[PDB]
Design a protein around this ligand. Sequence first.
Ligand SMILES: O=C1[C@H](c2cccc(Cl)c2)CCN1c1cncc2ccccc12
Ligand SMILES: O=C1[C@H](c2cccc(Cl)c2)CCN1c1cncc2ccccc12
Ligand SMILES: [Cl-]
Ligand SMILES: [Cl-]
Lengths: 305, 300
Amino acid sequence: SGFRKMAFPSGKVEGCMVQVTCGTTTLNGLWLDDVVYCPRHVICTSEDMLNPNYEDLLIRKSNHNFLVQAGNVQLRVIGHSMQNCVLKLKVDTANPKTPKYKFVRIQPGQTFSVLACYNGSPSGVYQCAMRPNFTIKGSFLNGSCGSVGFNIDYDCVSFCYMHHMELPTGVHAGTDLEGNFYGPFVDRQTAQAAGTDTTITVNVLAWLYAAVINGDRWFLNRFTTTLNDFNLVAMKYNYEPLTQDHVDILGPLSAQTGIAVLDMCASLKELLQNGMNGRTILGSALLEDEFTPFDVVRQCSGVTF
Amino acid sequence: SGFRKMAFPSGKVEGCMVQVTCGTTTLNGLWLDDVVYCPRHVICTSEDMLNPNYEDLLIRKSNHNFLVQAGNVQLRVIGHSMQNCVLKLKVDTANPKTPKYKFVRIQPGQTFSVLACYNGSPSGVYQCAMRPNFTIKGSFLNGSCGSVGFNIDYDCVSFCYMHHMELPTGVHAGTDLEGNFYGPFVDRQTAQAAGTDTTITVNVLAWLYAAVINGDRWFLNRFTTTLNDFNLVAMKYNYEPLTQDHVDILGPLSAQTGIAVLDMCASLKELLQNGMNGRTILGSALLEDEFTPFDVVRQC
Ligand SMILES: O=C1[C@H](c2cccc(Cl)c2)CCN1c1cncc2ccccc12
Ligand SMILES: O=C1[C@H](c2cccc(Cl)c2)CCN1c1cncc2ccccc12
Ligand SMILES: [Cl-]
Ligand SMILES: [Cl-]
């Protein structure tokens, strides 16, 4: 019993964190095989950030302008190239702690663990979801750029996020490991804002199934709904549309608890229209949307890595 | 910016998780140097659990009765001893991944990271607090006994908890790494229950200071309170008494935000009375009590 916001064990990722310095700028890098990946804005001064020409700024730099530190061992940069918004520093030594890995680009609603780092050293690990507005509600201070997001699928670390910036509302924006930003964001000091966010419907339903599995049934009712009637109510409350794919993905949880997906939709429809009436679900007064259906099954089954 | 329930990076602890088997019972062990630490109930059958005489059950066991597996490598048990509710298995190989470590016994209200494991393999990491009733609200299934709680302040891992059991309310009970249970609990299948739980007042105040540091001030008010008047009110909402030690511990956060501890206490008194009125504090509709003053300073 119990249901916690649980992150993947971060050990395989910790063995990849390095410190990257370019001039006065110091951030984190991801050392996989003989390449160190980091945000390309490491080559910029604060004036450059106003309107950077990264190709022109990078051509002025040489290998010895990048100082890479793996613990207390300095790695020597033997090449450098840019791929979208990420800088790839070719290093002279392959990381002996390189795990089995892949670079994956996730969709909004998908969750991942973030290993927050400062000066190449990991300080903490937390779970979060890619919001429908392509931001993440992370916890990052100055110096955390280059920190990564990941999932673990068996023995393979799937790197899905690299931290680049904080928007004025305190939410965060970054890229996949190929340097493509999630969202309409750019790596420049200019007016940027997170768009209006929505709730990840399939995740709330998954979390309602976790509450049922944990003995919380007060919100269940005798009712069912059509997918179309539920989607009209979802649009009303700033909830993401629930697709047939989402209904299929919730199938295992529906079979385990004996509550059909559209039966659980009528519970959620009632919660949206009436609130919780002083009650909590899994210790929460809000409907939680940062657990995917797979996260719920993994936690309520003990999948290990 | 942002405030998350953040766990310590678990890498140093993952390199210590091993699987321990005794008969039909399989749980997790903590492999530090040449010793594997695990709950002593690994030597019991379900039938032995009602009234186990661990000393009598252990004397019947030899080293080869304990199978220890570190990944895909079987470790050889060369000795065994019991210290309180923990079994210490002397193994033939020292763990090369043994980090700098210490065993620390924590007080209620303290937080720690839990690396939940099954079959010697880590499955997840989450942040926990030792409840005032000496239980933890964890996420543990059958097979998670031997999973550990820890803090990693300054390269050193301070092991503070080892999971042993789930109480009937779904909350968890365990020991420090010297085998002493937190709370009035025993490693027996007898009727046991968590005492009535309370909110960790000093932690809720610390989290209110984190909200102020992050730009949220809606809950602040022009009032202050005496320490005694605050405790008379807080007691009525099942909050732990706030001591002078707690007020001292909140000093740095009080100086940083410019809000006196007893002024922040008056905000909490008002939140207890009014609720949030549709608002949130750091993305929460409830008052969070699982961040210590130390955690708030670390993160903010
Ligand atoms: O957002 C930025 C800066 C920036 C500026 C323009 C464009 C880019 Cl891509 C990045 C670089 C550091 N940084 C931060 C990143 N995360 C958290 C932070 C918290 C507090 C201050 C800064 C933070
Ligand atoms: O509570 C126990 C059992 C037990 C019984 C009496 C005394 C002791 Cl010390 C231990 C051993 C396993 N175990 C569990 C431990 N954590 C989570 C669990 C979840 C679901 C079922 C069991 C769980
Ligand atoms: Cl450009
Ligand atoms: Cl402040």
